[PDB]
Design a protein around this ligand. Structure first.
Ligand SMILES: [K+]
Ligand SMILES: [K+]
Ligand SMILES: [K+]
Ligand SMILES: [K+]
Ligand SMILES: [K+]
Ligand SMILES: [K+]
Ligand SMILES: [K+]
Ligand SMILES: [K+]
Ligand SMILES: [K+]
Ligand SMILES: [K+]
Ligand SMILES: [K+]
Ligand SMILES: [K+]
Ligand SMILES: [K+]
Ligand SMILES: [K+]
Ligand SMILES: [K+]
Ligand SMILES: [K+]
Ligand SMILES: [K+]
Ligand SMILES: [K+]
Ligand SMILES: [K+]
Ligand SMILES: [K+]
Ligand SMILES: [Mg+2]
Ligand SMILES: [Mg+2]
Ligand SMILES: [Mg+2]
Ligand SMILES: [Mg+2]
Ligand SMILES: [Mg+2]
Ligand SMILES: [Mg+2]
Ligand SMILES: [Mg+2]
Ligand SMILES: [Mg+2]
Ligand SMILES: [Mg+2]
Ligand SMILES: [Mg+2]
Ligand SMILES: [Mg+2]
Ligand SMILES: [Mg+2]
Ligand SMILES: [Mg+2]
Ligand SMILES: [Mg+2]
Ligand SMILES: [Mg+2]
Ligand SMILES: [Mg+2]
Ligand SMILES: [Mg+2]
Ligand SMILES: [Mg+2]
Ligand SMILES: [Mg+2]
Ligand SMILES: [Mg+2]
Ligand SMILES: [Mg+2]
Ligand SMILES: [Mg+2]
Ligand SMILES: [Mg+2]
Ligand SMILES: [Mg+2]
Ligand SMILES: [Mg+2]
Ligand SMILES: [Mg+2]
Ligand SMILES: [Mg+2]
Ligand SMILES: [Mg+2]
Ligand SMILES: [Mg+2]
Ligand SMILES: [Mg+2]
Ligand SMILES: [Mg+2]
Ligand SMILES: [Mg+2]
Ligand SMILES: [Mg+2]
Ligand SMILES: [Mg+2]
Ligand SMILES: [Mg+2]
Ligand SMILES: [Mg+2]
Ligand SMILES: [Mg+2]
Ligand SMILES: [Mg+2]
Ligand SMILES: [Mg+2]
Ligand SMILES: [Mg+2]
Lengths: 45, 41, 77, 6
RNA sequence: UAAGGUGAUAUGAACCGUUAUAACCGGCGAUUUCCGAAUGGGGAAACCCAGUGUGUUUCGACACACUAUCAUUAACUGAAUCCAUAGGUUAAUGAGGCGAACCGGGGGAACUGAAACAUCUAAGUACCCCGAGGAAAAGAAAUCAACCGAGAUUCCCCCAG
RNA sequence: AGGGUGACAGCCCCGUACACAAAAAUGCACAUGCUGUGAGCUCGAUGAGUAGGGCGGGACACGUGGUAUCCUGUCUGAAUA
RNA sequence: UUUUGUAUAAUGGGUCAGCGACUUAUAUUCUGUAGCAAGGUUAACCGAAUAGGGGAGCCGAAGGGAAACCGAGUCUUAACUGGGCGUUAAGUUGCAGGGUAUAGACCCGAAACCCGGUGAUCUAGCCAUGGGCAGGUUGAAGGUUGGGUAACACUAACUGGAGGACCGAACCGACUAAUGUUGAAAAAUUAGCGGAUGACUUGUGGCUGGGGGUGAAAGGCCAAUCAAACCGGGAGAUAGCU
RNA sequence: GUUUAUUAAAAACACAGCACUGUGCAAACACGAAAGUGGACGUAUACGGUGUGACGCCUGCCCGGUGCCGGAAGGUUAAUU
RNA sequence: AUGUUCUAACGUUGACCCGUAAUCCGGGUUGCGGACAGUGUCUGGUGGGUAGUUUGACUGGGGCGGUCU
């Protein structure tokens, strides 16, 4: 049966990548929150 | 709008006399065309 | 935005109040109109987005005074 | 007017 | 400052040093890739691709610097349109992004309480947004008082549940 | 004070009290140049689409109430010692 | 534990170990206790000062009346024989405690509501750009050559190759049954079954976002979640219930 | 053909066809505080909405109620004054 | 207070010109509308399109009926 996760690196990066996050103020707030939490991996990039 | 006429305007008055006009008449016609000045001094 | 260029009148918030005193949020907008003002000094029409109140200010103060005020704020025409 | 060309 | 020393797991190796350039500590410098505001253009961050000017070469190439945007000012230029203005280019200066709280401002809930619920409450709270500073804001009476007087603002205790 | 040392150390060690120290950078408080900055006195002048008003809201402990006062989206609009 | 009542065949606990529920702040009243006593006590603050200063206040020693006001009385009433409340009862400030108030207020627990984000790698629809459909049938229109007509019509043969056409693999689907149901699998397997040139199917990429989308419409689907997604926050919502 | 991915595939949905109705174009309508954008690079033989559901034969009576459309003399009636 | 005409506010999703290498936008010219339209404030109507809610208790289970002083 076809499950929900069908990986595409292009779609991954376009959906959730660093530059997608930087493109909007809300995406930049994600990065701010993840930096403040001290995440080793800020994004899927 | 009290204005002062710079020429003889029709149904208003001659040069020099100062008339109360509707503000639209002053704003959009008499003043752009050089027929009245706002009563400033 | 709905901002008078002369006065800086902008949308303000308040309530609609029903007979039963139900408060629903509303806005009060300025009575804004784009108007071409004759500026005899510059020998030009300047279009300003102006509240009706702002037009009475221009009538009272003169367009040259008002435009000088706009230049000091750095508000463009 | 418009992405087609206008 | 020194008789030790070459950060840790972590030994070892090969060395360095012992009266002063070993190491170590502090000041000031130098170097400081790429990504990131990221700013030469682009982009799926850490990559791809340039222009221009100088200088250099073994003509295959190499090196270095500059080239974002906006605001302000200046110079020069420059439409419809004759003046002029818009526009264009170049220069200088500044800005940009990040940051826990506190601060000022623009917006602004509902659960809840009212033993239901709509006025009311929760609350101008949560939250979103903008802006600032070391604090901010406020501030030098078109203030109070009560016929006596006080004398800007801010904060604390009362007044008073 | 405190820590360490093969068990619990004033005197074993590191400290502690106390007394000293800066080539260089820099915070601060003063003293003193330079460049802006203008003190003082007489004569004045005294903030208008504003105050106030009508309508709608909001803010004031104060829910429009008999509701002062403040703010103003809208329409108006003085006197100015 | 809950009940009128439980060996109950009502509830809870597999066992052990560890953790797990009446608190805290402030106000108020009562009790105890200590100080001082018709007084008691200070708050902020000053003070290195648990000292000392600071009496601003607060409570008490007077009440009655809506109030002016009067005052050991006062109010009521024109006025009391009267009548109501008072006068003939020590307070106050600590400290400890009981209760109350406001706060999450003994702990755990909703379904939900609101705010800001994250999601169309699943799926729904659409958009752009590519791909797929073995093999076998049927034989529409049209054409041509004859016939037939005044001309058409009409008619035979040959040709032609239409279709949400037919049979059937791939491919897409999911009607029946059995199995499986702590599965091989959080939806499948096996045998049969429907569509299979289309309103088809599929790859890659794109767009639509939550009272919103998308829906040949089932409240379907929107990442194993849908009569209002998910994540974080308001948040310890509230819980007259267990 | 479509559908309740995962208990319903159907008589449900859709459908060509039909009818009513709106819409003169900056269309109605829809998404949008707005600018805009879709409708449509269309223009009433078009487009939206609604119901019905190939085809055949057909589709009767009721406008009192509720809508909608038209009228507007008169009654009543807001801010305003 | 209404009718007509006018142009100058205002509209233009007509044409042309320029910024321009751009159709968006702005400016200019010209036509067409034209104090209308449209927008602000106020105001009557309409308004399950959307929202917040309410929709009692007793009861030989509840509902229906009945009842409530
Ligand atoms: K509420
Ligand atoms: K309640
Ligand atoms: K020791
Ligand atoms: K005013
Ligand atoms: K029981
Ligand atoms: K049971
Ligand atoms: K107590
Ligand atoms: K006591
Ligand atoms: K008495
Ligand atoms: K006592
Ligand atoms: K609670
Ligand atoms: K409690
Ligand atoms: K939702
Ligand atoms: K079927
Ligand atoms: K009717
Ligand atoms: K024009
Ligand atoms: K008009
Ligand atoms: K409604
Ligand atoms: K009974
Ligand atoms: K019974
Ligand atoms: Mg860049
Ligand atoms: Mg770059
Ligand atoms: Mg900044
Ligand atoms: Mg309640
Ligand atoms: Mg300040
Ligand atoms: Mg005095
Ligand atoms: Mg031992
Ligand atoms: Mg003054
Ligand atoms: Mg005043
Ligand atoms: Mg006023
Ligand atoms: Mg007033
Ligand atoms: Mg008010
Ligand atoms: Mg029982
Ligand atoms: Mg028993
Ligand atoms: Mg039993
Ligand atoms: Mg039991
Ligand atoms: Mg048993
Ligand atoms: Mg039970
Ligand atoms: Mg059990
Ligand atoms: Mg008394
Ligand atoms: Mg077929
Ligand atoms: Mg299916
Ligand atoms: Mg099968
Ligand atoms: Mg078939
Ligand atoms: Mg078949
Ligand atoms: Mg249903
Ligand atoms: Mg799902
Ligand atoms: Mg909901
Ligand atoms: Mg809360
Ligand atoms: Mg809870
Ligand atoms: Mg079928
Ligand atoms: Mg099913
Ligand atoms: Mg089925
Ligand atoms: Mg259009
Ligand atoms: Mg039907
Ligand atoms: Mg019929
Ligand atoms: Mg409702
Ligand atoms: Mg509620
Ligand atoms: Mg309810
Ligand atoms: Mg009942």
């Amino acid at each position: 049966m076809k499950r929900t996760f069908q990986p595409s690196v292009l779609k991954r990066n376009r959906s959730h990548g660093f530059r997608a996050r930087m493109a909007t103020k809300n995406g930049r707030q994600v990065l701010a929150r993840r930096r403040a939490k001290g995440r080793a991996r800020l994004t899927v990039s | 709008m009290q204005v002062i006429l710079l020429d003889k305007v029709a149904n208003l008055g001659s040069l020099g006399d100062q008339v109360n006009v509707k503000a639209g008449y002053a704003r959009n016609f008499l003043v752009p065309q050089g027929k009245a000045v706002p009563a400033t001094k | 935005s709905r901002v008078c260029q002369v006065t800086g009148k902008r949308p303000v918030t308040g309530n609609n109040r029903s007979h039963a005193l139900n408060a629903t949020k509303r806005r009060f907008l300025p009575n804004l109109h784009s108007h071409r003002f004759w500026v005899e000094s510059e020998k030009r029409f300047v279009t300003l987005r102006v509240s009706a109140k702002g037009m009475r200010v221009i009538d009272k103060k003169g367009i040259d005074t008002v435009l000088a005020e706009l230049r000091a704020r750095g508000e463009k025409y | 007017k418009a992405x087609r060309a206008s």
